[PDB]
Design a protein around this ligand. Structure first.
Ligand SMILES: *C(=N)c1cncn1Cc1ccccc1
Ligand SMILES: [Fe+2]
Ligand SMILES: [Zn+2]
Length: 327
């Protein structure tokens, strides 16, 4: 029903087909906000999307081709299924052994707590996940343990010259780069607890990462070698999640890693800038470029509610999804 009605209303031609020109009008209906702005879609990208749904190449989208378009593209743009992913908002990264405010950029991690809690209070997400760095005491990422594991011949620094925040390269095939951190987020420790003032909503799901002594996992998805993953992706699929809102600590390390993996996994991905803090101004900007160049978007807390409710529908996310629907 509603669908044929939509197709009918944009088939100006009345020829039971959709030209590129009539499709461009669909896009202008889709990619706008409700504060009076219509987003600009480059004509090149316009045809890129169009060609996804013109599955035979006839230069038209007929009512048979449009089924795929309506069910799998238009419906997600107008009614996304939103997951909120709160990364590593843990004691050791705010006031303990790895207080981000002591890193180079001197940013204060406690400041993300207010806007995150406000989002949790005002936006009805379809799922909320909280990740926790969850390291065993013998974890490879600690300066404390650099002597436990043989170093690679490629590494500039060995167990006797390495200092906290240096990068070493461990042997054990394959060779493995690892930045060394103070002991942090050890399992069952105060430093691994979620910050006491972070709201843990009742439906919230905790995802534990970094548990293998031999490999780190900055990302809530795959570990740093992309060998093993958490069950986050499987849990997202069980919820029908289409869109992932990512925040937390640190912007340029775990948040960024998680956001890039979410894009790799195929999700429409939104990084909430002011709900994040990072360790280094230059690496934060490199993280932003990565997300932007892979068709994620970066937004402020105040934009999230209208996006999640489908009242502010961004064309970068529409393009992401059309490119993913190629396969
Ligand atoms: C991810 N951000 C992460 C997980 N374990 C260590 N790190 C890096 C880091 C966290 C907090 C502050 C500074 C660096
Ligand atoms: Fe860690
Ligand atoms: Zn066609």
């Amino acid at each position: 029903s509603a669908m044929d009605a939509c197709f009918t209303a944009f088939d100006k031609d009345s020829d039971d087909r959709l030209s590129l020109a009539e499709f461009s009008i669909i896009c202008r209906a889709l990619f706008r906000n409700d504060k009076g702005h219509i987003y600009d879609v480059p004509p090149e990208r316009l045809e890129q999307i169009f060609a996804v749904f013109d599955t035979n190449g006839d230069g038209f989208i007929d009512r048979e081709e449009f089924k795929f378009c309506w069910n799998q593209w238009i419906k997600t743009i107008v009614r996304p299924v939103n997951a909120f992913l709160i990364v590593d908002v843990q004691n050791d990264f705010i006031s303990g052994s790895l207080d981000i405010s002591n890193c180079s950029a001197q940013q204060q991690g406690h400041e993300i707590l207010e806007p995150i809690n406000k989002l949790l209070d005002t936006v009805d997400f379809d799922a909320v996940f909280y990740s926790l760095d969850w390291h065993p005491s013998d974890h490879v990422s600690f300066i404390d343990n650099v002597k436990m594991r043989p170093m690679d011949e490629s590494s500039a620094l060995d167990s006797d010259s390495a200092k906290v925040f240096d990068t070493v390269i461990f042997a054990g095939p394959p060779p493995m780069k690892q930045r060394l951190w103070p002991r942090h987020c050890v399992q069952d420790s105060w430093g691994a607890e979620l910050h006491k003032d972070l709201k843990v909503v009742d439906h919230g799901i905790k995802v534990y990462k970094g548990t293998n002594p031999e490999v780190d996992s900055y990302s809530v998805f795959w570990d740093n070698k992309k060998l093993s993953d958490t069950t986050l992706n499987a849990q997202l699929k069980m919820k029908g999640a289409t869109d992932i809102y990512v925040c937390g600590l640190a912007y340029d390390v775990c948040v960024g890693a998680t956001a890039v993996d979410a894009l790799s996994a195929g999700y429409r991905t939104i990084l909430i800038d002011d709900c994040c803090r990072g360790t280094d101004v230059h690496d934060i900007e490199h993280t932003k470029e990565k997300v932007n160049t892979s068709d994620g978007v970066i937004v402020h807390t105040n934009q999230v509610k209208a996006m999640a409710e489908g009242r502010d529908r961004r064309p970068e996310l529409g393009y992401k999804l059309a490119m993913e629907l190629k396969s």
